[PDB]
RNA sequence: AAACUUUCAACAACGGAUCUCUUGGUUCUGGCAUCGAUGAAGAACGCAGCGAAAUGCGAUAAGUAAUGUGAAUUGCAGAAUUCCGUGAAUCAUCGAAUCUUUGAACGCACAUUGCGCCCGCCGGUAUUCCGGCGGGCAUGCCUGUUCGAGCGUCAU
RNA sequence: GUGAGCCCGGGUCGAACGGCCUCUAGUGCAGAUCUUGGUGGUAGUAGCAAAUACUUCAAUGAGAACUUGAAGGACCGAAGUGGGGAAAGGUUCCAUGUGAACAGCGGUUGGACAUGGGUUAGUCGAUCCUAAGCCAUAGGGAAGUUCCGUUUCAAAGGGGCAC
RNA sequence: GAGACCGAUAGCGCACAAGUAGAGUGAUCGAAAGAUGAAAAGCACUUUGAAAAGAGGGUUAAAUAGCACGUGAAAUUGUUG
RNA sequence: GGGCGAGGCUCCUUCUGAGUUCCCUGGAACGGGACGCCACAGAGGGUGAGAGCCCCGUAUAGUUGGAAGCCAAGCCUGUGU
């Protein structure tokens, strides 16, 4: 149960915020869990997904399909995974939108900012664990 | 002949465009706007038409300066730059 | 005898804000006590007797101590409001008691 | 476009008499002569003096309008007023 | 008429530039609700009111 | 007209004999600048303006 | 709201041969013109005994 | 080409900034004619040129205002655009010193009988 | 894509074509119950129409 | 007997009720005090590669700078991002800026993109002509400065 | 089940809902020349009859009385069914193309729809002048929004000369 | 931040490019209008028509969801019995 | 009369627990069954159907970095014109 007065439990306000959130907020909303190997390596549970990540789909009709994220299409809150496409009538291929909560990240596209994110999340989790233990 | 035949003589203009409020309500002979009361200093408004008041009240336009004021109040009308910011 | 011959609905006052106003008053009192600590939250009031023959059987707190009371207690009139004593120059002492 | 009016350009704008120069600079005659000598403002001669001033004679002194404009910005005017 | 003021001709210029149908790429946008120009003007239907 | 001819001289070294102007029905101004007979408007449009 | 169903200008067309005597929105050029107003039985009107 | 970054602009002084504004305006002037006479990827370049001109003008204005503030640092009267904005009511509000001025009798009374720190035993 | 957008533009006109408007600029709302035709009484004196 | 009219049923029409939904209203409660001549509210006109509107913005024109985040925007086209970075974004924040014609609206006017005046700067053969650019010129009132008027009161 | 109603079967459909006891109300419709919306008979009916009038061949086109060219026949009859303007309109002007809608019949045509193009001045107007008239200023009214006042009971400014 | 409130003829006039479209010389008056599908996967290709479209064949879990689009009542209409 | 002032408060910032385990239906489990785990968090929302443990958030102590104010235990000093 929420206790703070700045927290609202209004369903109308929650849906308005979710469907009118700007792009930087939608990046945080469009997060995906890490694989078990990545979680034990980095001590990180979830991270926002971006282009170049390797993902495995764990929900839906395209389950157990793996591939690279080719587009993070934030306008309909979906991602596109390579080779996870369907055929239009004319025979061309159109990508299939997958929600980031239906995939698991198997390989991270690593750079300086991603390492900073992982390091600060891991440090925060460790200091929370020491404070609460 | 007060109807259709008389309606054929309607080719003058009682009102022109008013410079201040943009409506076609500036009386061409009196030089007084029927809507906003130009060229009087005050804008014409009355309490017997709350619809007319809310058609032109503050916030129905652009708020080109007034919309920036609450953020400046929230930051306390501060001046200067962030410390270590690039510039002159 | 019902007085509803004016436009009474224009100035009907409801009191849904009674608990919120109690909360606001309590928060203001807490802030005042925290600002005034370790001093008391109020001033010392004298004991006075209510006027008229209906209420002269009962005593209550008054506004402030008289100048004669402060002089007989040895408290200067400029020091008295600075140490939590309320001062009333209008009241006089008509009796010894 | 619009028709020009006579006497609004040319020598009438190029020259002014000493009376007009003194009234323009709001000086006395000794101060004006002193400032003209100190700043090197020299007398001039129009081709036709009637085009500049209809009441001009042979003894009328003329000056350049731009020279009087330059004299308008001389800091000695404030010195003259301060001394007065 | 042929005799017109600069202000009047400027407002007529703005009306002439506004008098168009919507571009066809508008309807292909994601979440588009605009189907046609609902403020389109014609010289026989609605007066400019100048 | 003076601003148009000064702008043409400053931008393309173009010397004009006369300039006519009209405000078009869309609201923009159109200027007909007739060049001096010394220069060729076709050559100027080919080299500088690129209108071939 | 206390003003709901009352922000219209409407007058009855009187006793006649055609229509009911409900107040009707004046003016023209829109669907609302001539339509009933202010009644609890009318669309876009004030409800009977508004809640306080 | 056509993208000028603010980091290199912050180090220049006035002369080459006005120069670079001159070129960026000149390639904007030619590629407008290139836009009306042909097509391609040059539209990104005219967009970049417009933003570069905006950035250069911003840098020039900022450096001029910084120099003017340095010049007017120790002067009594400042230009109106260099004076602080706040609101009109804030600018007409009394100064802190004038609002804090008290009378001589009040100062003596506050000096010799201030509000004391005290407690009452229970 | 051009064929699809053109089909969308043609399908956007179906309601106004059923309403028989002369294009998207015809938004005229006519009076289907005029006050002079649906109010008042005819007396012995001056009438409002012949 | 059919057709026609009516009734009953199935399917198909017409029309948009019902049911479910709700980035919206309505009412209450809590907090806060912040418009404008340093030019407001409002109006008009413009600005995107491809927009009419809504939204945003002002010729630095769906925007600039600064801070932060850290890889997009998307309908198409075209370009990305040295990804181990002064750095995408229709991102957030926002202290520096820009801010057209107007409007209490302020040179005089305005049913005119009309007519001026003052002072500088630049260009065209130019002491004179022509053109452009910049800064200014409303009213009432207050304090002060300076220039004055009056046998109004005096001294000399 | 007397009844208001309740329950089930079958078909359709797609995300919520019900029984019992209490609590609560914007709680039960055939009417109000009721409101809004939708739909019939009338009825393929009334009608589409002022302004004298049309016809032939060819082309275009899926389709031609009302598109075009030619060929004929007529009308306006110079106070015109001609050639140009003022007000008003605002792009209706011109070229190219065109599904539907509109042109009370049709339509390949169109003032319709779509994309583009088009309005060049020292001499034509405006701009300048004043008329009938209107508005500032001085000053006086008015609680005031403002009213009167336009030459006033105003210090309301120009020129010249100077050793 | 909430509600024993309303759930698109309700609730603000406005849940939508709403004080908009539109009307009036003007003061002013002032609407109608939400819902395909989880995802456009918004029907390739063939055939008939000048075209609109139709039929095969497809997509979809479903077109008995085809941008006239959730469900699809009644008045009223067509066919069949 | 002056000057320090530990410490505290207000405001933006970094960070926080646990299943996508097996079976059935289904286009898609967020449904049913089984086995667990977290909980100062079983408020709310999203995700292809009713999700504490898929995601954002939610609870509580705190924990990074920054700015400007206020309160303040105490401590140095001038002394009476
Ligand atoms: Zn006006």
JSON list of N, CA, C and O in Angstrom, two decimals, chain C residues 40-55:
[
{"chain": "C", "resi": 40, "resn": "UNK", "atom": "N", "xyz": [7.82, 27.94, 26.56]},
{"chain": "C", "resi": 40, "resn": "UNK", "atom": "CA", "xyz": [6.44, 27.47, 26.40]},
{"chain": "C", "resi": 40, "resn": "UNK", "atom": "C", "xyz": [5.77, 28.09, 25.18]},
{"chain": "C", "resi": 40, "resn": "UNK", "atom": "O", "xyz": [6.15, 29.16, 24.70]},
{"chain": "C", "resi": 41, "resn": "UNK", "atom": "N", "xyz": [4.75, 27.39, 24.69]},
{"chain": "C", "resi": 41, "resn": "UNK", "atom": "CA", "xyz": [4.06, 27.82, 23.47]},
{"chain": "C", "resi": 41, "resn": "UNK", "atom": "C", "xyz": [3.14, 29.00, 23.68]},
{"chain": "C", "resi": 41, "resn": "UNK", "atom": "O", "xyz": [2.65, 29.58, 22.70]},
{"chain": "C", "resi": 42, "resn": "UNK", "atom": "N", "xyz": [2.87, 29.39, 24.92]},
{"chain": "C", "resi": 42, "resn": "UNK", "atom": "CA", "xyz": [1.96, 30.48, 25.22]},
{"chain": "C", "resi": 42, "resn": "UNK", "atom": "C", "xyz": [2.55, 31.37, 26.31]},
{"chain": "C", "resi": 42, "resn": "UNK", "atom": "O", "xyz": [3.64, 31.11, 26.83]},
{"chain": "C", "resi": 43, "resn": "UNK", "atom": "N", "xyz": [1.81, 32.41, 26.66]},
{"chain": "C", "resi": 43, "resn": "UNK", "atom": "CA", "xyz": [2.22, 33.38, 27.67]},
{"chain": "C", "resi": 43, "resn": "UNK", "atom": "C", "xyz": [1.44, 33.15, 28.96]},
{"chain": "C", "resi": 43, "resn": "UNK", "atom": "O", "xyz": [0.33, 32.61, 28.95]},
{"chain": "C", "resi": 44, "resn": "UNK", "atom": "N", "xyz": [2.03, 33.58, 30.07]},
{"chain": "C", "resi": 44, "resn": "UNK", "atom": "CA", "xyz": [1.36, 33.48, 31.35]},
{"chain": "C", "resi": 44, "resn": "UNK", "atom": "C", "xyz": [0.22, 34.48, 31.43]},
{"chain": "C", "resi": 44, "resn": "UNK", "atom": "O", "xyz": [0.41, 35.67, 31.17]},
{"chain": "C", "resi": 45, "resn": "UNK", "atom": "N", "xyz": [-0.97, 34.00, 31.80]},
{"chain": "C", "resi": 45, "resn": "UNK", "atom": "CA", "xyz": [-2.14, 34.85, 31.87]},
{"chain": "C", "resi": 45, "resn": "UNK", "atom": "C", "xyz": [-2.57, 35.03, 33.32]},
{"chain": "C", "resi": 45, "resn": "UNK", "atom": "O", "xyz": [-2.44, 34.11, 34.14]},
{"chain": "C", "resi": 46, "resn": "UNK", "atom": "N", "xyz": [-3.09, 36.20, 33.68]},
{"chain": "C", "resi": 46, "resn": "UNK", "atom": "CA", "xyz": [-3.59, 36.41, 35.04]},
{"chain": "C", "resi": 46, "resn": "UNK", "atom": "C", "xyz": [-4.93, 35.73, 35.24]},
{"chain": "C", "resi": 46, "resn": "UNK", "atom": "O", "xyz": [-5.57, 35.25, 34.31]},
{"chain": "C", "resi": 47, "resn": "UNK", "atom": "N", "xyz": [-5.37, 35.71, 36.50]},
{"chain": "C", "resi": 47, "resn": "UNK", "atom": "CA", "xyz": [-6.68, 35.19, 36.86]},
{"chain": "C", "resi": 47, "resn": "UNK", "atom": "C", "xyz": [-7.59, 36.37, 37.16]},
{"chain": "C", "resi": 47, "resn": "UNK", "atom": "O", "xyz": [-7.29, 37.19, 38.04]},
{"chain": "C", "resi": 48, "resn": "UNK", "atom": "N", "xyz": [-8.69, 36.48, 36.41]},
{"chain": "C", "resi": 48, "resn": "UNK", "atom": "CA", "xyz": [-9.62, 37.58, 36.54]},
{"chain": "C", "resi": 48, "resn": "UNK", "atom": "C", "xyz": [-11.02, 37.02, 36.73]},
{"chain": "C", "resi": 48, "resn": "UNK", "atom": "O", "xyz": [-11.30, 35.86, 36.42]},
{"chain": "C", "resi": 49, "resn": "UNK", "atom": "N", "xyz": [-11.91, 37.86, 37.25]},
{"chain": "C", "resi": 49, "resn": "UNK", "atom": "CA", "xyz": [-13.28, 37.47, 37.53]},
{"chain": "C", "resi": 49, "resn": "UNK", "atom": "C", "xyz": [-14.20, 38.04, 36.45]},
{"chain": "C", "resi": 49, "resn": "UNK", "atom": "O", "xyz": [-14.06, 39.21, 36.07]},
{"chain": "C", "resi": 50, "resn": "UNK", "atom": "N", "xyz": [-15.11, 37.21, 35.95]},
{"chain": "C", "resi": 50, "resn": "UNK", "atom": "CA", "xyz": [-15.97, 37.60, 34.85]},
{"chain": "C", "resi": 50, "resn": "UNK", "atom": "C", "xyz": [-16.94, 38.70, 35.28]},
{"chain": "C", "resi": 50, "resn": "UNK", "atom": "O", "xyz": [-17.40, 38.72, 36.42]},
{"chain": "C", "resi": 51, "resn": "UNK", "atom": "N", "xyz": [-17.26, 39.63, 34.39]},
{"chain": "C", "resi": 51, "resn": "UNK", "atom": "CA", "xyz": [-18.21, 40.70, 34.73]},
{"chain": "C", "resi": 51, "resn": "UNK", "atom": "C", "xyz": [-19.65, 40.20, 34.75]},
{"chain": "C", "resi": 51, "resn": "UNK", "atom": "O", "xyz": [-19.94, 39.04, 34.47]},
{"chain": "C", "resi": 52, "resn": "UNK", "atom": "N", "xyz": [-20.54, 41.13, 35.12]},
{"chain": "C", "resi": 52, "resn": "UNK", "atom": "CA", "xyz": [-21.99, 40.96, 35.30]},
{"chain": "C", "resi": 52, "resn": "UNK", "atom": "C", "xyz": [-22.33, 40.01, 36.45]},
{"chain": "C", "resi": 52, "resn": "UNK", "atom": "O", "xyz": [-21.50, 39.22, 36.89]},
{"chain": "C", "resi": 53, "resn": "UNK", "atom": "N", "xyz": [-23.57, 40.10, 36.95]},
{"chain": "C", "resi": 53, "resn": "UNK", "atom": "CA", "xyz": [-23.95, 39.34, 38.13]},
{"chain": "C", "resi": 53, "resn": "UNK", "atom": "C", "xyz": [-24.19, 37.88, 37.78]},
{"chain": "C", "resi": 53, "resn": "UNK", "atom": "O", "xyz": [-24.20, 37.01, 38.66]},
{"chain": "C", "resi": 54, "resn": "UNK", "atom": "N", "xyz": [-24.34, 37.56, 36.49]},
{"chain": "C", "resi": 54, "resn": "UNK", "atom": "CA", "xyz": [-24.52, 36.17, 36.09]},
{"chain": "C", "resi": 54, "resn": "UNK", "atom": "C", "xyz": [-23.23, 35.38, 36.20]},
{"chain": "C", "resi": 54, "resn": "UNK", "atom": "O", "xyz": [-23.23, 34.24, 36.67]},
{"chain": "C", "resi": 55, "resn": "UNK", "atom": "N", "xyz": [-22.11, 35.97, 35.79]},
{"chain": "C", "resi": 55, "resn": "UNK", "atom": "CA", "xyz": [-20.85, 35.25, 35.68]},
{"chain": "C", "resi": 55, "resn": "UNK", "atom": "C", "xyz": [-19.82, 35.66, 36.72]},
{"chain": "C", "resi": 55, "resn": "UNK", "atom": "O", "xyz": [-18.68, 35.19, 36.65]}
]
